[PDB]
């Protein structure tokens, strides 16, 4: 019934025990009496209390060790009180000797009576049957004796009667074992106990298949048959959680990249759910993640092109200006790449790329600044520049669908000053404005800028409005105040000039 592995038992025997008794006749007898319920046992009895001198031997069959160090013997026996039975004192006894002999031979024909090693003279503890004459009651005394260390292949057991009235009910032969337990995520196997009751066995158990040994896992096997407090911890591998005592896989929609004490984290925003036991949640179509980027980070989108572009030309150099992109995607690392196309010269789409050594003062490509300057260009030639918005993920992601570009000419002059300005609708709150296009545009007109500063009063902040149309108005202005306006023409070529200083006083 106990966790201890049994070697020899009176109940477990196939039919008869078949034990050698010396002497055969007038010695130990195989008188079998049935025990409740339906259990057949071979009971050994001897009662030669009357005869003066008594010597008895009962040798058991071959008992294999099976890799055991210390064996525990449990004997169940019934006795008789020498005073309760008629006869001379001393002739009757209340004690019996126990013997053991180590051997390597499987089927030994005979074991010497002198070669046996004595263990202890056993008496019925605590109480013993007399037996009571009025009513008959069964005994409850079971005696245990230990034997070790053992060197040979196996052993034989013997019993010696010195003139007592004894009945051996059951003989239990077992060896104390440490159970197979999985503690601190590491597996520990079943182990045998030491040579002594004080002895302990150091058991270094291997970790689970889906785990890695961070610390050496070890335990001590106690003689009682129980495992001791663990030394060293094991942690489950990446993509496997430390739950239920055995390495489990991450659920559908969960991941683990590093072998940490924490459980499988849920997929980051915009990340596609992978199968059971995932290292990192994969990025779905349209969203991606960089190689040098952390696994915890969400799937980032590529950047949009910068919406506004401003260009200014010099005698041999050109200047480009732009703002921040609309959709960052998530990543903060945004750099700008300037690409020379040379497609401006000529009407067809087919063109030759800028092969000549084009120099750039801030940076060639991957510029973190919002402004760029091209030092050298060829005169009388039409060029076209593409400002590419580059992300840290844009390389891993597909090449951006669009990039804001502007076609500019090096030799062409900036637009001239505007001829005249006229206010069409003047009121106490609003002042309308209308103007003509400059006499010399030197390129297609793209934008107009109007200045707004206070006259006959302290130098205020000159407000600049941007309008593609040649007509503009103002909302929210103080009455009875003088204002001066200047219209400036802006083309692809560059910066224009201020207009006629139109003094308009509010109604």
């Amino acid at each position: 019934p106990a966790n201890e592995v049994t070697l020899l038992d009176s109940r477990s025997v196939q039919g008869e025990l078949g034990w050698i008794a010396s002497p055969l006749e007038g010695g130990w007898e195989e008188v079998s009496i049935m025990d409740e319920k339906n259990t057949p046992i071979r009971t050994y009895q001897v009662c030669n209390v009357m005869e003066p001198s008594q010597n008895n031997w009962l040798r058991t069959d071959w008992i294999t060790r099976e890799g055991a160090q210390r064996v525990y013997i449990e004997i169940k026996f019934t006795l008789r009180d020498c005073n309760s039975l008629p006869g001379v004192m001393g002739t009757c006894k209340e004690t019996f000797n126990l013997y053991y002999y180590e051997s390597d031979n499987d089927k030994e024909r005979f074991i010497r009576e002198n070669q046996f090693v004595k263990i202890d003279t056993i008496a019925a503890d605590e109480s013993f049957t007399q037996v009571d004459i009025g009513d008959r009651i069964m005994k409850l005394n079971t005696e245990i004796r230990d034997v070790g260390p053992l060197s040979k292949k196996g052993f034989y057991l013997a019993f010696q009667d010195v003139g007592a009235c004894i009945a051996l009910v059951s003989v239990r032969v077992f060896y104390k074992k440490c159970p197979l337990t999985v503690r601190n995520l590491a597996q520990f196997p079943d182990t045998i106990t030491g040579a002594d009751t004080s002895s302990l066995v150091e058991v270094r158990g291997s970790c689970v298949n889906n785990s890695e040994e961070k610390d050496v896992p070890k335990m001590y096997c106690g003689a009682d048959g129980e495992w001791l407090v663990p030394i060293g911890n094991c942690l489950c591998n990446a993509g496997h959680e430390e739950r239920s005592g055995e390495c489990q896989a991450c659920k559908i929609g969960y991941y683990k990249a590093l072998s940490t004490d924490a459980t499988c984290a849920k997929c980051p925003p915009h990340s596609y759910s992978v199968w059971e036991g995932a290292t990192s949640c994969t990025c779905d179509r349209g969203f991606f993640r960089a190689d040098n980027d952390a696994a915890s980070m969400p799937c980032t989108r590529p950047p949009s092109a910068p919406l506004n572009l401003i260009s200014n030309v010099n005698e041999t150099s050109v200047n480009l200006e732009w703002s921040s992109p609309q959709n960052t995607g998530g990543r903060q690392d945004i750099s700008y790449n300037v690409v020379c196309k040379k497609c401006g010269a000529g009407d067809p789409s087919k063109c030759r790329p800028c092969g000549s050594g084009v120099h750039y003062t801030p940076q060639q490509n991957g510029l973190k600044t919002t402004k760029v300057s091209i030092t050298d260009l060829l005169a009388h030639t039409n060029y076209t520049f593409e400002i590419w918005a580059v992300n840290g993920v844009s390389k891993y992601n597909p090449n951006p669908d669009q990039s804001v570009s502007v076609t500019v000419t090096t030799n062409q002059a900036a637009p001239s000053s505007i001829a005249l300005v006229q206010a069409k609708e003047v009121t106490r709150y609003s002042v309308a404005l209308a103007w003509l296009e400059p006499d010399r545009p030197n390129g297609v007109i793209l934008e107009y800028e109007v200045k707004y500063y206070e006259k006959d009063q302290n130098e205020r902040s000159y407000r600049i409005v941007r309008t593609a149309a040649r007509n503009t108005d103002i909302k929210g202005l103080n009455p009875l105040t003088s204002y001066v306006f200047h219209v400036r023409a802006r083309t692809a070529a560059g910066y224009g000039d201020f207009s006629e200083p139109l003094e308009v006083t509010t109604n």
Partner: protein, 136 residues
């Protein structure tokens, strides 16, 4: 010294009904269960539960509140021939439950079938212990 009894209905001694054995002090009794070969489909096979009853239980074939359970012939296909049960006719027994025997007295044994007889007739054995004068 030793007495051998084969417990089966096929035996001519049991069929008579008056089957008795005269035993002495410290003599042995060996009861053999009915052994059958592997070819037998276990239908014709006999299985008995032995009881040690009094004179009232011997004639009426009853064991309820009259006797005690002794041995059982459960498995007929035993490896070392038939099932053997030993009984020593000792005056004093060292075992707490072990049965004692007195000279010049009668002891009775009955057997009930596991599958059955229907309380009509049971296989019985009469045991008489000869006194000290008769035994040497």
């Amino acid at each position: 010294d030793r007495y051998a009894v084969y417990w089966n209905s096929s035996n001519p001694r049991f069929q008579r009904g008056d089957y008795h054995i005269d035993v002495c002090i410290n003599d042995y009794l060996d009861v053999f269960c009915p052994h059958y070969e592997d070819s037998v489909p276990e239908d014709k096979t006999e299985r008995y539960v032995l009881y040690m009853v009094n004179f009232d239980g011997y004639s009426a074939c009853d064991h309820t509140s009259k006797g005690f359970k002794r041995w059982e012939c459960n498995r007929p296909h035993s490896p070392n021939g038939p099932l053997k049960f030993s009984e020593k006719f000792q005056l004093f027994t060292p075992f707490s439950l072990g049965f004692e025997f007195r000279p010049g007295r009668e002891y009775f044994y009955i057997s009930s079938a596991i599958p059955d007889n229907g309380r009509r007739s049971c296989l019985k054995l009469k045991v008489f212990v000869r006194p000290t004068n008769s035994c040497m």
